[PDB]
A paper describes a structure:
The fourfold symmetrical structures of both Kv4.2 alone and the Kv4.2–KChIP1 complex were determined to an overall resolution of 2.9 Å by single-particle cryo-EM analysis with C4 symmetry imposed. The transmembrane domain of Kv4.2 adopts the Shaker-type topology, with the S1–S4 voltage-sensing domain and the S5–S6 channel pore forming helices composing a homo-tetramer in a domain-swapped manner, whereby the S1–S4 voltage sensor interacts with S5 of the pore domain from the neighbouring subunit. It adopts a depolarized S4 up and S6 open conformation in both Kv4.2 alone and Kv4.2–KChIP1. The C-terminal intracellular S6 helix continuously extends from the transmembrane S6 helix toward KChIP1, which was not observed in previous studies. In addition, the intracellular S6 helix interacts with the T1–S1 linker in the structure of the Kv4.2–KChIP1 complex. In addition, the open conformation of Kv4.2 complexes revealed several Kv4-specific residues involved in the intra-subunit interactions between the S4–S5 linker and S6, as well as the inter-subunit interactions between the S4–S5 linker and S5.
Modulation of voltage-gated potassium (Kv) channels by auxiliary subunits is central to the physiological function of channels in the brain and heart. Native Kv4 tetrameric channels form macromolecular ternary complexes with two auxiliary β-subunits—intracellular Kv channel-interacting proteins (KChIPs) and transmembrane dipeptidyl peptidase-related proteins (DPPs)—to evoke rapidly activating and inactivating A-type currents, which prevent the backpropagation of action potentials. Here we report cryo-electron microscopy structures of the Kv4.2–DPP6S–KChIP1 dodecamer complex, the Kv4.2–KChIP1 and Kv4.2–DPP6S octamer complexes, and Kv4.2 alone. Thus, our data suggest that two distinct modes of modulation contribute in an additive manner to evoke A-type currents from the native Kv4 macromolecular complex.
Numbering used by the authors:
A (entry chain D), B (entry chain A), C (entry chain B), D (entry chain C): 163 to 207, 215 to 417
The structure:
């Protein structure tokens, strides 16, 4: 550390298992992320069965912003130790941090002038994206992201073949299960749900074929789901085994 | 290109990533196929909740035939550049193209003189087989077809063993779940649906055993389904990994 | 063929792809087995909706016995060409043949003097075991039998661990889902069905947990089902790949 | 055996396939373990449909205490033949032995002074943990325990990644399926049940999405369940095959 504090605090940020301040910072950031997400889960769950976010959610507000505050300041700390400050901002981790921290300020701006319920649930949904801040803490998430980036073509073919099979089988089932007495196959988009439930070997029973023609193609769909889905599964797993092993 | 335009346009057809006209033709064919299938999906989805194919389906007609028209002319182009014209027609891709383009003309001939609903749904089902025209655009579908052709014996054994197990377990369940109060196991063909749902580990709950004898054999069927199905799954996937890798 | 017809007809029986009489015998035996099983399936499927086995089942009788007759005589032929006649009888294929042919004669003896319905459904269940007579025709069935015999210890451990996990999870679910309003977990044996449905990732929805304690252990059971079942799955498949490849 | 009886009876305990006294002790303990767990299952299955534990449980209590007494005395014999008696107690095998016999003695103390139903079912739940005493008899269970310990990090990542996906998908599903007419997605913890069932490709149909937004994310959850769960499955199986093979 022959120069200013930037590099000697960045080495603590980049390597949290060294020194003692880095470990404390790592633990406190992890604890704050965990407590924030647990608080969100808890607040999601007499005149009525009022949830824990109407009579409460004063402290659940302050607590939340406290966590957010910490995130902001630590992000500022990560802006005070980056030789590649602009490139660091362009990095995926900085993007995840910004996506995690923006909802609170966006909601504050929205509630400063007027208030609408259209972005309320949207912002609350985006608020859970602070789970992904555990990527720094856990190596497994980084390995999973690396594998998903590596086999990008395999996921593309997975999506393309899945959409193709879904369209084909939904069309077949809709045209084979249209004249039933009480049929839920009102359209091909309404048969997309049944096709994706059957292909993944999930099964729900809400939408089932009630015709001989629809049962024959309702069982081939299940077999074709195994064939289509299980082609890119090994390559994702093999990449995970290869990348994780090569890091050792 | 020392000779006529046939070979110099076939090199563009066979290789769409070369030149600039070939890329435009490839993109326009892909876009037309996609818009045709999306139009079919959309048209499949006050006096009544009238779908988008009764008040509409004038433009949905013309649009459709426009796509069909393009297919026809491009097929004619593929007939103007094939040194193996007859052999090219005998190829699988040409068969797929004719299967995709025939429904429209067949329906026109049928509606020219009288009209019946027997072939209406059949032709509408056949119309979605222009999805398979994406085989030229996507290498993954070609690899999948090559693998399915290569491991033809394993698929045959899959079908044979699946039919054998289905027959055995359907007979056992029908004769074990026949005397129930309100039983849907009226016959072995009526137990084929339950057997194929249970073997594929899908589960629907519409048809479940309600007897101790039927529950014992209704759980062995689920385990036997995993054993039977998972034998040819690796060989299909291994061939896909081998063929795709050997192309690189 | 320097000696009597026994060996020169056994070489046709053992090798059905040689000569021309052996191929005809192989095809006729396969056709008779297939028509017998199809006849059983069909006969299993106004005053009432009478099945095809009450107004019918005279020709369905004669047809059936005809098939049985053929089996008997061909078995006699296999007794006229075996140098190891006693050892051949001790073979698994001969046991399968006797198991397939006995039901008819046993039923004839039973119906000769009095008649009971206790053994009626049992004999009809045993009647489908002529499906296994396709082992001679299909090499895949023989390979599957060889693999199942080879990894006998792995199937034993599969059964033991499956029973252990089923007992543990059924006890936990019964004692966690006992005090519900309308609970189908009346006893530990009654929770065996739910446990085996959940472990195999099948799902039916007839028996589901309705308590927080029962839901936590109702989801661990599903994960533990994947772990237990997927341990002997590769070894069965790997043996199938190894044995089938080594035959080539 | 140049010294006292401790070692010459310990070799029978550690190696039950040697001599003849060890084999008798090996089978007699397994029979009493088997009959104990069967009795626990059986006891759970006019004024009312009284189970077999109220009119009975005068012979069952004697039967149960007979098994426990054998378990205790054989544990004491293992304490009279262990050179590492203090270390042997700390072993995992001895821990299971104490856990198997503790509920019976704790229950006797509990019922001596007053009686409560809070620990009545809790002690009965612990009573099935004598199933794990089969680890000595079965080599597969010992290997299964070794492989779960070997890949402890992979299971640690499985729990962390699964909690990651469960929380992320439940939050999306809860907010997308909240304004339905009769929705069971009352809260994120109430949506944890749906997520874990969907991810494991199980399917129950009690909780299903009824909105277009909830169906899109209700199908990605099923695909993401396969991706997350199938990462540590091969390493558990590969370790099991490797450890089992290296034992031979």
């Amino acid at each position: 550390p022959t120069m200013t504090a930037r590099q000697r605090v960045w080495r603590a940020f980049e390597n949290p298992h060294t020194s003692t301040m880095a470990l404390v910072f790592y633990y406190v950031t992890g604890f704050f992320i965990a407590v924030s997400v647990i608080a969100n889960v808890v607040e999601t769950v007499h005149i009525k069965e009022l949830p824990c976010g109407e009579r409460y959610a004063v402290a659940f507000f302050c607590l939340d912003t406290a966590c957010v505050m910490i995130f902001t300041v630590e992000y500022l700390l990560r802006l005070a130790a980056a030789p590649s400050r602009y490139r660091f901002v362009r990095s995926v981790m900085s993007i995840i941090d910004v996506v995690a921290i923006l909802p609170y300020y966006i909601g504050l701006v929205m509630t400063d002038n007027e208030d609408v319920s259209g972005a309320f649930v949207t912002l609350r949904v985006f608020r859970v994206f602070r789970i992904f801040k555990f990527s720094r803490h856990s190596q497994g998430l980084r390995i999973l992201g690396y594998t998903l980036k590596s086999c990008a073509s395999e996921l593309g073919f997975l999506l393309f073949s899945l959409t193709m099979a879904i369209i084909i089988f939904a069309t077949v089932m809709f045209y084979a299960e249209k004249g039933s007495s009480a049929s839920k196959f009102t359209s091909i988009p309404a048969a997309f749900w049944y096709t994706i439930v059957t292909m993944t070997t999930l099964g729900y029973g809400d939408m089932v074929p009630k015709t001989i023609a629809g049962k024959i193609f309702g069982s081939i769909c299940s077999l074709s789901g195994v064939l289509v889905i299980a082609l890119p599964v090994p390559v994702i797993v093999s990449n995970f085994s290869r990348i994780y092993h090569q890091n050792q």
